[PDB]
Structure 1
Amino acid sequence: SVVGGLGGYMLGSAMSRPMIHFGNDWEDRYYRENMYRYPNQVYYRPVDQYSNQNNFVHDCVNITIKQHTVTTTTKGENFTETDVKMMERVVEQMCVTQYQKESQAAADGRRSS
């Protein structure tokens, strides 16, 4: 068992829903129709072995957007580029906070910070 079949990733716990405003008329309703479908939790690898938060977020969004995209079509969840491009944001806003929770016992000290 490795968080669902990953290269040594882990899973925190259920996050908040962000407030994403694409400025649109369809995207706002799109977002409001899948706000609870979207992955309330995000996968990550340990910030200890990162450089910046950037790469961490790159792959913490991306690995969520592979895992939650494949392992959810069991319920018929069929996230196209349209849902994926929302997840890129949704999971980013969550993942920023995620690093602020995992860095705590990892890179909270050891970022000279």
Structure 2
Amino acid sequence: GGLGGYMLGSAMSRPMMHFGNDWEDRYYRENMNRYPNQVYYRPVDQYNNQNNFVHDCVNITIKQHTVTTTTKGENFTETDIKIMERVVEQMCTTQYQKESQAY
């Protein structure tokens, strides 16, 4: 992620997400193309519970996406970070589910 050990998953379909209010739903519809469609992570063998994996997958993926987006001149607000937190969490979850069923 700038220092080693993370791997990049295949791209996943962006989910329909409902955020519980009109303004965030509209915001989401308009801004969702700006958020990742793939996750960075560390091998599944290296975590105790899916909970950690997910937590880690999320901060690292988002932080790296933030460096590549920022270099390009545009910035994420706190709302961006919040939403990104949720959707990257679901995607990391699908990723854990997928990598662990390696049997």
Structure 2 unaligned runs (5+)?
A: none
TM score, norm. by length of structure 2: 0.89
Change (3 A) 1:68 1:51: same
Residue correspondence of structure 1 range 1-113 to structure 2 within 5 A: 4-104=1-101
| Segment of structure 1 superposing worse, 89-98 or 5-14 | 5-14
Please give the root-mean-square deviation of Cα atoms over the aligned residues, in Å. 1.4
Structure 1 unaligned runs (5+)?
A: 105-113
Check whether the contact 1:15–1:41 (CA below 8 A) recurs between aligned residues. Answer: yes
Cα deviation digits, residues 5-49 of structure 1 (max 9, x gap): 143110012111012211112111111112221100111111101
SS in 2 for 1:22: coil
Identity in percent: 94
The list of structure 1 runs, each at least 4 consecutive aligned residues, that deviate by more than 6 angstroms after superposition, is none
How far apart are 1:62 and its partner, in Å? 0.8
Structure having the larger proportion of residues in helix: 2
TM score, norm. by length of structure 1: 0.81
